[PDB]
Short mmCIF file of N, CA and C and ligand atoms in Angstrom, two decimals:
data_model
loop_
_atom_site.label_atom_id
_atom_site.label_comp_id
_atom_site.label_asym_id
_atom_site.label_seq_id
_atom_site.Cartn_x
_atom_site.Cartn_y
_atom_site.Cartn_z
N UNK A 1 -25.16 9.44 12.62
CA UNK A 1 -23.94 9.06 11.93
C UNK A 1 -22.93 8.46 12.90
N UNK A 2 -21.99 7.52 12.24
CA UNK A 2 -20.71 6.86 13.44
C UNK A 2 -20.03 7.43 12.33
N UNK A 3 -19.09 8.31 13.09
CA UNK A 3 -17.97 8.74 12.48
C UNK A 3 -16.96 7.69 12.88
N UNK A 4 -16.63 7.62 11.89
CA UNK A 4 -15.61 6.12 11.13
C UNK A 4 -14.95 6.35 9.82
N UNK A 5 -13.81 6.80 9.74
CA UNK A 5 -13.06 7.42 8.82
C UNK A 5 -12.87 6.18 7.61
N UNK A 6 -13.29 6.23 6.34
CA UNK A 6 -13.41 4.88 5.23
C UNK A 6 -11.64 5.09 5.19
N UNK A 7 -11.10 3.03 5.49
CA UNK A 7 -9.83 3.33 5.53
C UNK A 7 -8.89 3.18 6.51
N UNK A 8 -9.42 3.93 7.82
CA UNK A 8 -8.78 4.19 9.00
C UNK A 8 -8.10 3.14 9.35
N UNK A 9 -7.18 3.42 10.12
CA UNK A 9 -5.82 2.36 10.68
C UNK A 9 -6.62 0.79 11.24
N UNK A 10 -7.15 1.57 12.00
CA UNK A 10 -8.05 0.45 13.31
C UNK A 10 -9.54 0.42 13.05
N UNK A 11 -9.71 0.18 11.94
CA UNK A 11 -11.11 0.09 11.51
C UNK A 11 -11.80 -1.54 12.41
N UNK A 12 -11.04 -2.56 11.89
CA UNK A 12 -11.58 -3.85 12.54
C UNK A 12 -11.91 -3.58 14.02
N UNK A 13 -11.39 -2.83 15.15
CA UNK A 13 -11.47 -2.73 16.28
C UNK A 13 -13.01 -1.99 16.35
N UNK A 14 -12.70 -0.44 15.98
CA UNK A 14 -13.90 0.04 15.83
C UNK A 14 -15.36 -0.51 15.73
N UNK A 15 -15.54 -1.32 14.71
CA UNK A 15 -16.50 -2.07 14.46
C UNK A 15 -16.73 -3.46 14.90
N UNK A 16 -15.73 -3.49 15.98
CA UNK A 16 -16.23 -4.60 16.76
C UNK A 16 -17.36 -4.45 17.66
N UNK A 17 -17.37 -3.50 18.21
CA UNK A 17 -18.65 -2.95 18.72
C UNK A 17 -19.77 -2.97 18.11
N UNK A 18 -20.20 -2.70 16.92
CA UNK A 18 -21.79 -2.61 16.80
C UNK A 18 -22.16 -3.90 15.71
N UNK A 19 -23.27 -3.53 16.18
CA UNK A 19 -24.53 -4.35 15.79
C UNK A 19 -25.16 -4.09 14.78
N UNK A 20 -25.95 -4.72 13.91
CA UNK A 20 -26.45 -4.19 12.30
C UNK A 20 -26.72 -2.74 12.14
N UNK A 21 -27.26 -2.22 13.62
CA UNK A 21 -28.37 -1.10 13.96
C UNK A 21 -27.43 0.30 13.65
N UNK A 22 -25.81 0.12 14.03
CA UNK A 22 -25.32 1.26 14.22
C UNK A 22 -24.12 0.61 12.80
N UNK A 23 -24.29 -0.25 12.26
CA UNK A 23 -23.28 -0.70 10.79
C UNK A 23 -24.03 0.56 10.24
N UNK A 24 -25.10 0.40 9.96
CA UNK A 24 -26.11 1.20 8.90
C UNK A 24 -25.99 2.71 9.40
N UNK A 25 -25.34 3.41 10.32
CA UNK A 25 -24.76 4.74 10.59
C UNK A 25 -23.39 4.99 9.76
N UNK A 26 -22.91 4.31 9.11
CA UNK A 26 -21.49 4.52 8.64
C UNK A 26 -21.32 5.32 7.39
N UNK A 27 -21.03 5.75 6.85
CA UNK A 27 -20.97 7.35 5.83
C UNK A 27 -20.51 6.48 4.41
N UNK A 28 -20.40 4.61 4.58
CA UNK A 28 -19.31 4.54 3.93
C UNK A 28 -20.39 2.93 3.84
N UNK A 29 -20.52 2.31 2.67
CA UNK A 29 -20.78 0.85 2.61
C UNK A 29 -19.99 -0.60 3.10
N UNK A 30 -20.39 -1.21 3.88
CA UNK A 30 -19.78 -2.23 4.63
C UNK A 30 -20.33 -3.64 4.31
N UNK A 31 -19.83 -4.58 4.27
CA UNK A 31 -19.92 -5.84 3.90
C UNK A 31 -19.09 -6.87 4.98
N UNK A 32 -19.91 -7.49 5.64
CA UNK A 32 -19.10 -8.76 6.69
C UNK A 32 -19.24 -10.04 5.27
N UNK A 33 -18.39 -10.50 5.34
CA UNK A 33 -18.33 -12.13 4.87
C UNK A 33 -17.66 -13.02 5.68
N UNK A 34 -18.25 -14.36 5.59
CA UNK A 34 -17.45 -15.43 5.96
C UNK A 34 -16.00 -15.69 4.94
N UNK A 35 -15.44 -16.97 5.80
CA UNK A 35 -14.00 -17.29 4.63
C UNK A 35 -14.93 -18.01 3.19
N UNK A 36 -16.09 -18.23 2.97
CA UNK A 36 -16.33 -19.07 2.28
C UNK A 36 -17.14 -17.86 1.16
N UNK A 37 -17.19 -16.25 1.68
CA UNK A 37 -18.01 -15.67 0.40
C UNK A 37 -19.18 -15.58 0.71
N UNK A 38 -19.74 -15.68 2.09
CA UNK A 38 -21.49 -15.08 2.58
C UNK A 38 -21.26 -14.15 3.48
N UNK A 39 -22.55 -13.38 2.86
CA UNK A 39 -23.27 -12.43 3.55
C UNK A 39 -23.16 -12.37 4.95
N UNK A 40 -22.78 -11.87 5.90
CA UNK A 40 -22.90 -11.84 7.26
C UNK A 40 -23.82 -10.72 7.58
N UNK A 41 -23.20 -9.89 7.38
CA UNK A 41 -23.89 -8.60 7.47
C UNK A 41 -23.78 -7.65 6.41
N UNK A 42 -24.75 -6.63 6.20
CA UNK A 42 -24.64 -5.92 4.58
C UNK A 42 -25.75 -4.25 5.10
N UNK A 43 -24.83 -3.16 5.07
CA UNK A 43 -25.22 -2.22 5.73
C UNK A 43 -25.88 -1.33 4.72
N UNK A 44 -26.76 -0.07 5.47
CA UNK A 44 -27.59 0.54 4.11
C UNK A 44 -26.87 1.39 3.63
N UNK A 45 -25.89 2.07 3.79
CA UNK A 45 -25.39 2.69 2.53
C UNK A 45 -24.72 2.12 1.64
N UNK A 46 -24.32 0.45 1.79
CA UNK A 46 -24.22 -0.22 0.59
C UNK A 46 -25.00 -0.27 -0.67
N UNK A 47 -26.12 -0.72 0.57
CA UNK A 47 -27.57 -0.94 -0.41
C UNK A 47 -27.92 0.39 -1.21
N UNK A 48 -27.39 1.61 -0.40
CA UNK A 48 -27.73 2.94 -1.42
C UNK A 48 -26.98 3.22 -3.25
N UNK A 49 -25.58 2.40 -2.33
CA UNK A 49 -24.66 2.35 -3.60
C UNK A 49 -24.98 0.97 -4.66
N UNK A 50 -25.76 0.21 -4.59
CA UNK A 50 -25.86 -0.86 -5.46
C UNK A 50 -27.29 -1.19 -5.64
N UNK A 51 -28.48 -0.93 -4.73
CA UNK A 51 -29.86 -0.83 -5.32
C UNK A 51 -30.01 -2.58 -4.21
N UNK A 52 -29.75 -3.03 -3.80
CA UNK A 52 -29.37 -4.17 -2.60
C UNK A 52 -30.39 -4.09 -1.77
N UNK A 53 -31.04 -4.87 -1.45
CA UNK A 53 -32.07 -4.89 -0.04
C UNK A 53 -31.39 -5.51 0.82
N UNK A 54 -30.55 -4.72 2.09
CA UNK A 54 -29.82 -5.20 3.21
C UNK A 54 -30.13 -6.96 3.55
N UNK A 55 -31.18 -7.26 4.17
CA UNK A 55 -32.30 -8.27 4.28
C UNK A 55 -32.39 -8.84 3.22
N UNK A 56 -32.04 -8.49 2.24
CA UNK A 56 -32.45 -9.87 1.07
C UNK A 56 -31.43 -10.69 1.14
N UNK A 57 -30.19 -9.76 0.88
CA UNK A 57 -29.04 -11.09 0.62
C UNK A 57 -28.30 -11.07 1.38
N UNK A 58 -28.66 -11.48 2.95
CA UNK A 58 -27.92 -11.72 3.95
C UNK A 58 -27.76 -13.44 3.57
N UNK A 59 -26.82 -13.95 4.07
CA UNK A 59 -27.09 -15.24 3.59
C UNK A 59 -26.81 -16.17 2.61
N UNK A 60 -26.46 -14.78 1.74
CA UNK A 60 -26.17 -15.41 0.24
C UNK A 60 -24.70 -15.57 -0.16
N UNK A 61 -24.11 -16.06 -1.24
CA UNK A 61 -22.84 -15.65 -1.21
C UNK A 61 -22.21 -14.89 -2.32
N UNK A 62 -21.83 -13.65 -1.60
CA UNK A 62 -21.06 -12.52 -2.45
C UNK A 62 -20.73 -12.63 -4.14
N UNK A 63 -19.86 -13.93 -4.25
CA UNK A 63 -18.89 -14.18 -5.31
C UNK A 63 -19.48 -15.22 -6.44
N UNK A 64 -20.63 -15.69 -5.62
CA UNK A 64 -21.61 -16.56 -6.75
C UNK A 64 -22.98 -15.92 -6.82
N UNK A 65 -23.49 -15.61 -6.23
CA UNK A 65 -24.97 -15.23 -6.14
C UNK A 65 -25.03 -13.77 -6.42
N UNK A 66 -24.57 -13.07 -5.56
CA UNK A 66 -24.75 -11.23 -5.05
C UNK A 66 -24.03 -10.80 -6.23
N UNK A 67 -22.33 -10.88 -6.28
CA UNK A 67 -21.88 -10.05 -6.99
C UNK A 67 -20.87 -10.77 -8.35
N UNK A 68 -21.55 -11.12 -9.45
CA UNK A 68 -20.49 -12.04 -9.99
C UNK A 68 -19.46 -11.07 -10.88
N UNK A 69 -19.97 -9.56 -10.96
CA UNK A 69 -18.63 -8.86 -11.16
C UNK A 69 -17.31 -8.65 -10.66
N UNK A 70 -17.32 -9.71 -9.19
CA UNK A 70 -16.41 -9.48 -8.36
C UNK A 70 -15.78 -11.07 -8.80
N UNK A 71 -15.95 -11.76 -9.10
CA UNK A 71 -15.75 -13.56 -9.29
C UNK A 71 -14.62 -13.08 -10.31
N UNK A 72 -13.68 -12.91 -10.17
CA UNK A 72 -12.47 -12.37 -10.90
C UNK A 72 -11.06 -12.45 -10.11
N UNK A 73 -9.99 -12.73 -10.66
CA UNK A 73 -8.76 -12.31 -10.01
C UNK A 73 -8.27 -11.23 -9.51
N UNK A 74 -8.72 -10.15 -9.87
CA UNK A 74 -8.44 -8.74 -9.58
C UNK A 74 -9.41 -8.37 -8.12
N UNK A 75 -10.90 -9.48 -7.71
CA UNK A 75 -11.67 -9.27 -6.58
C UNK A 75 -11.20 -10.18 -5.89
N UNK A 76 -12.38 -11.65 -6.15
CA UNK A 76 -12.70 -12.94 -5.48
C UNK A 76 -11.11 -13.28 -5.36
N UNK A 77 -10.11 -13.34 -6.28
CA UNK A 77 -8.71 -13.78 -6.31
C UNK A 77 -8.23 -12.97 -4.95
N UNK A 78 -8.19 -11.87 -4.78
CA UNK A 78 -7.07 -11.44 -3.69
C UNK A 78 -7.89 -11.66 -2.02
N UNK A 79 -9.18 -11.87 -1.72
CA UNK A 79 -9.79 -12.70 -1.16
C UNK A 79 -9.91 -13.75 -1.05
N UNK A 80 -9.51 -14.51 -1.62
CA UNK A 80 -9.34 -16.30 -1.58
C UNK A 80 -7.69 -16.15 -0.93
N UNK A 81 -7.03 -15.17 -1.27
CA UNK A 81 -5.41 -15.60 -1.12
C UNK A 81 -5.85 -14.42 -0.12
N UNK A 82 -6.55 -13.96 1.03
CA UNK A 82 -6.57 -13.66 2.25
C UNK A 82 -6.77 -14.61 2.94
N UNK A 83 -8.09 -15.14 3.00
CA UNK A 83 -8.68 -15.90 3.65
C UNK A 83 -7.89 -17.12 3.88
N UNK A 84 -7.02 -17.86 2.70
CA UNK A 84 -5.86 -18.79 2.69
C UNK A 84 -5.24 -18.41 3.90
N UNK A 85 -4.56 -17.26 3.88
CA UNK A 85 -3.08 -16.90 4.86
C UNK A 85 -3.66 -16.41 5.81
N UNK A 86 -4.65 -15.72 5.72
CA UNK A 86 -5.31 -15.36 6.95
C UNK A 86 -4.82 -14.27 7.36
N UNK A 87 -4.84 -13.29 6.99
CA UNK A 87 -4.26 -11.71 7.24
C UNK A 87 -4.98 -11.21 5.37
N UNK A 88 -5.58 -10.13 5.45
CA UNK A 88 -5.86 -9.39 4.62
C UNK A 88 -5.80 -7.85 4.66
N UNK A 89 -5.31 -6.82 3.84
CA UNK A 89 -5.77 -5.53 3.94
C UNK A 89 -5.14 -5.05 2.55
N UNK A 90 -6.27 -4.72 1.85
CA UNK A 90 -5.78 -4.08 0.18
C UNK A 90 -7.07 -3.12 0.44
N UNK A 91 -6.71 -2.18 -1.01
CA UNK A 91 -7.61 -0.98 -1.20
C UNK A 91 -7.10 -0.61 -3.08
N UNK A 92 -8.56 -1.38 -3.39
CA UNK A 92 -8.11 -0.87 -4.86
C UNK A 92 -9.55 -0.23 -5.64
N UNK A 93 -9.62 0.02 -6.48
CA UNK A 93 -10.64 1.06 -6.92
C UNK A 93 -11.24 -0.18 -7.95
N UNK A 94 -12.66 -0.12 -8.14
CA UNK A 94 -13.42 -1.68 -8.74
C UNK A 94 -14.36 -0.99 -9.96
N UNK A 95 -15.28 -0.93 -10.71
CA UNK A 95 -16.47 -1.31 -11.14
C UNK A 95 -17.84 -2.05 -11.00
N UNK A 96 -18.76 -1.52 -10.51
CA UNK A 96 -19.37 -2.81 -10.35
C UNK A 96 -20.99 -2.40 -11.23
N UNK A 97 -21.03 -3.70 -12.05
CA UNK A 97 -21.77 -3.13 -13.06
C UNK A 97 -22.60 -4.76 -13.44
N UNK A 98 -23.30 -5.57 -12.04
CA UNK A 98 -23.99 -6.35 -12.39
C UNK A 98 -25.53 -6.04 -12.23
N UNK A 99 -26.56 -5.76 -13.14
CA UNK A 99 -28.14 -5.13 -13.26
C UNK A 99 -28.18 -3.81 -12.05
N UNK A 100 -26.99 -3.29 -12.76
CA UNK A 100 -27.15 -1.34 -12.07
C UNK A 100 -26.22 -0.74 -13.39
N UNK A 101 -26.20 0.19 -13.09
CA UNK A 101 -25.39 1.07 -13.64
C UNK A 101 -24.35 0.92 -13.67
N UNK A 102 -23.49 1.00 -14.37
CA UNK A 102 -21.83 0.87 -14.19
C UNK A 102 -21.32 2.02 -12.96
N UNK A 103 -20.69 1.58 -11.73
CA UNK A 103 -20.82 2.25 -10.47
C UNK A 103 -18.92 2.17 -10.11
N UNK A 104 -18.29 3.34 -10.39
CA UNK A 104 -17.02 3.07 -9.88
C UNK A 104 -16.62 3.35 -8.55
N UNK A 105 -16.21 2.32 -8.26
CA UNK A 105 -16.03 2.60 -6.31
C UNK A 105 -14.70 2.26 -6.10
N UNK A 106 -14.95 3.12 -4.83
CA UNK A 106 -12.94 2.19 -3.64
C UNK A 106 -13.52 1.38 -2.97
N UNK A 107 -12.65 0.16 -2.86
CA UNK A 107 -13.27 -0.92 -2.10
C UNK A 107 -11.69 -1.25 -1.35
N UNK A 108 -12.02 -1.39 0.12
CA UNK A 108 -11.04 -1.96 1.06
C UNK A 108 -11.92 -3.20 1.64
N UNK A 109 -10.39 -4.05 1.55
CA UNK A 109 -11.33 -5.71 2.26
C UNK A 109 -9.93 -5.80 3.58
N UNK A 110 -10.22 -5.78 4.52
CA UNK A 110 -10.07 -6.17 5.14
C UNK A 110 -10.35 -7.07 6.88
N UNK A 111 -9.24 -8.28 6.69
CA UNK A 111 -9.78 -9.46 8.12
C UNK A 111 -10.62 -8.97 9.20
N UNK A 112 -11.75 -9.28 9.89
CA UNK A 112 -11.77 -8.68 11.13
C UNK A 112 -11.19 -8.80 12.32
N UNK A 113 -11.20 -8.57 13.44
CA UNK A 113 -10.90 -8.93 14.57
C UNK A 113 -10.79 -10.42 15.06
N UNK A 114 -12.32 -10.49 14.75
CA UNK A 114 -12.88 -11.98 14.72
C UNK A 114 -12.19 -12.83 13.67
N UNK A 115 -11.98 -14.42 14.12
CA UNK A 115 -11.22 -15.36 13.67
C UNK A 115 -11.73 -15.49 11.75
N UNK A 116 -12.60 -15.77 11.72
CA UNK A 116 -13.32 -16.44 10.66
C UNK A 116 -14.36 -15.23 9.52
N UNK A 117 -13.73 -13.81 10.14
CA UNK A 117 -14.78 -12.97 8.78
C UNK A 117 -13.73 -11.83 8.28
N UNK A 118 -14.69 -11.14 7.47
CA UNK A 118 -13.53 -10.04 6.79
C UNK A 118 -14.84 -9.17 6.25
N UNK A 119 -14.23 -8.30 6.29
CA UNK A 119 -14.99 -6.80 6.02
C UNK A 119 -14.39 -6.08 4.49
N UNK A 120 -15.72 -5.99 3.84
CA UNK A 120 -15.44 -5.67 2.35
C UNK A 120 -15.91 -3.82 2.77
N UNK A 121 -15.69 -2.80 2.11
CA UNK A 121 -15.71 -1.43 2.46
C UNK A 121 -16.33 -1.02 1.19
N UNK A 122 -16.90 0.10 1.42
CA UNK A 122 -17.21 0.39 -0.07
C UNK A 122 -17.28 1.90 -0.19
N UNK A 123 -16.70 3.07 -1.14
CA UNK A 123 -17.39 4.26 -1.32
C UNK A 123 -17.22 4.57 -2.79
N UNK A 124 -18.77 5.53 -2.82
CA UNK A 124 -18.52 6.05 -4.23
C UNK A 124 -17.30 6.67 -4.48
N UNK A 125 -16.40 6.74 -6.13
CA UNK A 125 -15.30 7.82 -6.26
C UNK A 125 -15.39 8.14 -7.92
C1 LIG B 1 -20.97 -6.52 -9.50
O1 LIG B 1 -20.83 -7.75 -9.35
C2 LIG B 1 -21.75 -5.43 -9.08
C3 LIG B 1 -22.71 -5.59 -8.12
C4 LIG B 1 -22.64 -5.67 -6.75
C5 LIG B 1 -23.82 -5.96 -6.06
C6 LIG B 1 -23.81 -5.92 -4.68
C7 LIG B 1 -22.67 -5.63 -3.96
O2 LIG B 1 -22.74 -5.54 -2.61
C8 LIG B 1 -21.47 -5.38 -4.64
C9 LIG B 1 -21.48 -5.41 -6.03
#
């Protein structure tokens, strides 16, 4: 396990350090995207929470392909108006109910460290 508090102040720092190998230690589902809505990286307790093959949809993009429950103003909307201004950090509670179960989660998106990605968060609630 990487103890990594879902949330925490300095999360972007934290996870500047690892590599896919130790993402997939996190207690908590993680999502890298580009500004454009792809896959960067996609960790396994995501995949636990959504039925996701880490490896399948690296690559793909989130808001058209992966998740079109999120292609909404209340998701894709406050992500487009991050990625615009370039500073992001919200935490709001979602649904996600595309060929799974209707799955209610907290989801925090926030910028990373790095210039050009942002980190989507995920836990069951
Ligand atoms: C809604 O669009 C629900 C599905 C879903 C699939 C994968 C990920 O990572 C988030 C949400």
């Amino acid at each position: 396990m990487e103890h990594v508090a879902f949330g925490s102040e300095d999360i972007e720092n934290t996870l500047a350090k690892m590599d896919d190998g130790q993402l997939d230690g996190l207690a908590f589902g993680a999502i890298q995207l580009d500004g454009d809505g792809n896959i960067l990286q996609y960790n396994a307790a995501e995949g636990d929470i959504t039925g996701r093959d880490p490896k399948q949809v690296i690559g793909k993009n989130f808001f058209k392909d992966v998740a079109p429950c999120t292609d909404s103003p209340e998701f894709y909307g406050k992500f487009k108006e991050g990625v615009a201004s370039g500073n992001l950090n919200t935490m709001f509670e979602y649904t996600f109910d595309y060929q799974m179960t209707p799955t209610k989660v907290k989801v925090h998106m926030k910028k990373a460290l790095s210039g050009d990605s942002y980190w989507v968060f995920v836990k069951r609630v």
